[PDB]
Amino acid sequence: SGFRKMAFPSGKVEGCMVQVTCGTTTLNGLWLDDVVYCPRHVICTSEDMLNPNYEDLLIRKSNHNFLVQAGNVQLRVIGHSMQNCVLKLKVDTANPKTPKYKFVRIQPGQTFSVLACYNGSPSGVYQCAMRPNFTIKGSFLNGSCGSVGFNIDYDCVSFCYMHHMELPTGVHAGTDLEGNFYGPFVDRQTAQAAGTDTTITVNVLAWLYAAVINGDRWFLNRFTTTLNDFNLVAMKYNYEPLTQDHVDILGPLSAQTGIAVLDMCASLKELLQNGMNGRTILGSALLEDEFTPFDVVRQC
Amino acid sequence: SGFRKMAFPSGKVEGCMVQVTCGTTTLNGLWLDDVVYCPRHVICTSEDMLNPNYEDLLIRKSNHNFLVQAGNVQLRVIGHSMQNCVLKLKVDTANPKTPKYKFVRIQPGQTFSVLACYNGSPSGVYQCAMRPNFTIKGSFLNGSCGSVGFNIDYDCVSFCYMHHMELPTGVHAGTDLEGNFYGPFVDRQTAQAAGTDTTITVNVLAWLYAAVINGDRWFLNRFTTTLNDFNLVAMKYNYEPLTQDHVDILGPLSAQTGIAVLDMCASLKELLQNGMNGRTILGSALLEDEFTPFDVVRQC
């Protein structure tokens, strides 16, 4: 029983975090085999950030301009290259703690664990969802750049996010581990801002299933609705549209609770139209959208 | 920016989790130096759980009745003893991954990280608070017994909780690492239930400071209140009483935001009396009480 935002155990990732310094800038890097991955903006000065030409900035650097430290051990940089918005620093030592890993790119609506780091040192771990607008609502302070997001399945770490910057609303933007940004964001100084967002409908339904599994049933009803009628209500309340694949993905939770997906959609329609009338669901007074169907099955 | 329930990095604890089996019961143990700590109810059969005499049950056991596995390595049990509600299994191998550690007992209102485990295998990590009624609102399924709660300070792991059981409301009860239960709970079958709970007032104030630090200011006012007048309102809304020590503990956050503690207490009084009127604080429509002043300073 119970339901918490739960992150994956972070040990496998902790053993990969290092500190990268170039000039007066220190941030975090990810050390896998003999490569250290970090944000390329580590090579920029404050002035460089307006209209930086990273190709020119990187040609003016050499291996000795990058200081890499794993704990108290200095790692010798023997090569450097740029891959999209990430820097790849070849080092003379393969990380003996390298887990089985993969570089995956996630979709909006999916969740992952973040290991917030500062100066190569892990500070905390929490769960995040990639929002529909490609931003994440993380918790990051100055020096968190290079922190990574990941999922773990059968001891294999699937890295999906590297932290690059904070946008004006306090939300966060970053790339995949191949250095490709999530969303229409750039690693240069602009007035870039998060675009309009929407609520992840399939995740809200998954969370209602988790609530029913944990004994919250006040929002249930005998009514059902059609997918088309539910989608008209979703559109009115800025909720993502629900597809048949979403309905199929919710099958296992529907079967376990005996509540048809379209029956739960009728409950969600009522909650959007009437509110909770002072009641709560899994300790929340708002509809939660940062738990995927997999997150609910994993914990419930 | 941002504010999340954030757990400590769990690697140091992951390296201590083992699987303990006795009879047909498997649960988790904590392996530190050459001792494995686990719930003593591992030695009970279902029938044993009504009126168990643990002293008699443990005399009828021998070292070979305990199977301990660290990953795929079997650890030989060479001694066994009872300490309050925990069992201490002496093993022939000191854990080479033992961190610097301490056994601390926490107070109600304090927070800690939980590493949920199943069959000796870490599944996830999340933050919990010890409630005023000595229960925790965790996320634990069958097999989670022996999972531990902890805090980390400068590489030293302060273990404060071992999981023993789920109460009828879905909340959780356990002991400190010396085997002493938190609250009026026992490791035997009874109709024991969580007692009445209260809201942790000092934590709510800390969270309002975190909200102000992150740009939420709609609930602020020019009014102030006295500690005595605030305490009469706290008592009416089932909030713990606020003491001068609490006010002193909130000093740093008060100084950083320039909002006097009693000025923030006037904001909390208004929120309790009027509600939020459809607004939210740090993404919540409820007053959060599971972040301590230290949690806010750590992340903000």
**Taking CB atoms and an 8 Å cutoff, what residues of chain A touch B298?**
123-124
Residue A85, token pair as written in the block: 């918005």
Q: Which residue of B has its CA nearest to A144?
A: B1
CA–CA–CA angle B256, B258, B264 (5° rounding): 105
Range of the structural domain that residue B247 is part of: 201-299
> For residue B22, which phi and psi values (nearest 5 degrees)?
-140, 120
* Approach to solving: X-ray
Are B139 and A215 within 8 A, CB to CB?
no
Nearest CA in chain B to A137: B2
B80 catalytic? Reply is no
Q: Which residues of B touch A170 (CB under 8 A)?
A: 1-2, 214-215
- CA B145 – CA A219 distance, rounded (Å): 32
**Cα–Cα distances in angstroms (integers) from residue B261 to residues B205, B250, B251, in the given order:** 8, 7, 7
Q: What CATH number corresponds to the domain at position A253? A: 1.10.1840.10
Q: What one-letter code names the amino acid at A44?
A: C
Tell me how far apart the alpha carbons of residues A259 and A223 are, in angstroms, rounded to a whole number. 11
For this entry, resolution in Å reads 1.5
A1 CB neighbours in chain B (<8 A) are: 139-141, 166, 170
Closest CA to A284 of A293, A276, A273, A292: A276
- The DSSP code for A164 is E
Sign of CA dihedral A165, A171, A177, A182: negative
Helical ranges in A189-292 per DSSP H:
201-213, 227-236, 244-249, 251-257, 261-274
Choosing from B38, B117, B145, B300, the catalytic residue is B145
Q: From the list B12, B126, B215, which residue is nearest A170 (CB)?
A: B215
- Element housing B43 (H / E): none
Q: Which of B1, B139, B215 lies closest to A6 in CB terms?
A: B139
Distance CA(B148)–CA(B17), nearest Å, equals 9
User: Domain holding B53: CATH number?
Assistant: 2.40.10.10
Residue A158 in tokens: 């699937």
Whether residues B139 and A115 touch (CB distance < 8 A) is answered with no
Q: Going by C-beta distance under 8 Å and a sequence separation of 6 or more, which residues neighbour residue B254?
A: B209, B260, B261, B264
User: B284: which strand partners?
Assistant: B281
Q: Residue A155: left (phi > 0), alpha (psi -120 to 50), or beta? A: left
Question: Is residue A117 flagged as an active site residue?
Answer: no
Q: How far is B56 from chain A (nearest CA, A)?
A: 32
Tokens read off for B113: 């990280």
Give the CA distances from residue B258 to residues A7, A141, B229, B240, B255, in Å, rounded to whole numbers and listed in that order. Answer: 34, 21, 22, 25, 5
